[PDB]
Amino acid sequence: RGSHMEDFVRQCFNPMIVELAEKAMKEYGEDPKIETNKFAAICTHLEVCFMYSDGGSKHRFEIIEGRDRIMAWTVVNSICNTTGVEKPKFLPDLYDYKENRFIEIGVTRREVHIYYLEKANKIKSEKTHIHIFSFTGEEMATKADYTLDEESRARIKTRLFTIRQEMASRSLWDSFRQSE
Numbered sequence: 001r002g003s004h005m006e007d008f009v010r011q012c013f014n015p016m017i018v019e020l021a022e023k024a025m026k027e028y029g030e031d032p033k034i035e036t037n038k039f040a041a042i043c044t045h046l047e048v049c050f051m052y053s054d055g056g057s058k059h060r061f062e063i064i065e066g067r068d069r070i071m072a073w074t075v076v077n078s079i080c081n082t083t084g085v086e087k088p089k090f091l092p093d094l095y096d097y098k099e100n101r102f103i104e105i106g107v108t109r110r111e112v113h114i115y116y117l118e119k120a121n122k123i124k125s126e127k128t129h130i131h132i133f134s135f136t137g138e139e140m141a142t143k144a145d146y147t148l149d150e151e152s153r154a155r156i157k158t159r160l161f162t163i164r165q166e167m168a169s170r171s172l173w174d175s176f177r178q179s180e
């Protein structure tokens, strides 16, 4: 079953981002052939974390998302026994060396309020920072500390809205929005 969402994701995202998404889905027992909306979601999430790490300075962020489970953990432990930060209960996305805290990036289709409420209740470990983006343009972070500057986050929102426009122009946005 070859879907339109799959071919659009392959045409829309970076080949390496696509490959990393495929590796993650297959590692967690999911099929990008049929789990197409999830495939698109993890592609957007990967690109957003990569642009996020692109912001800031040179040695600012350590990248956890993208790495496979065991190695991503290994880096989390290295960072913990180096800086002395509480080991998070679940795998985060990045680590800020300048602010000395883990970062859980979030990309949501609906209201940022609901999404951050859910992920903050599911995290509980209030040490790690939370930064939520949305396709419609909103963003919201812990303590209103949006970590990066305004221009990088504006870039991220522009990319998200471009992806949303492409999905809508291919008659694929409605199935994507009702997926989360």
Ligand SMILES: O=C(NCCc1ccncc1)c1[nH]c(Cc2ccccc2C(F)(F)F)nc(=O)c1O
Pocket: 024, 025, 028, 038, 041, 042, 045, 091, 092, 093, 104, 105, 106, 107
């Ligand atoms: O880290 C993450 N997953 C880590 C494990 C994983 C990675 C890739 N594929 C499957 C598993 C992660 N996942 C999501 C979206 C999500 C939320 C709840 C359950 C499942 C998923 C999805 F779609 F990924 F399967 N939003 C984030 O912001 C985020 O950080």
Ligand SMILES: [Mn+2]
Pocket: 065, 091, 092, 093
């Ligand atoms: Mn993650």
Ligand SMILES: [Mn+2]
Pocket: 045, 093, 104, 105, 106, 107
């Ligand atoms: Mn995340």
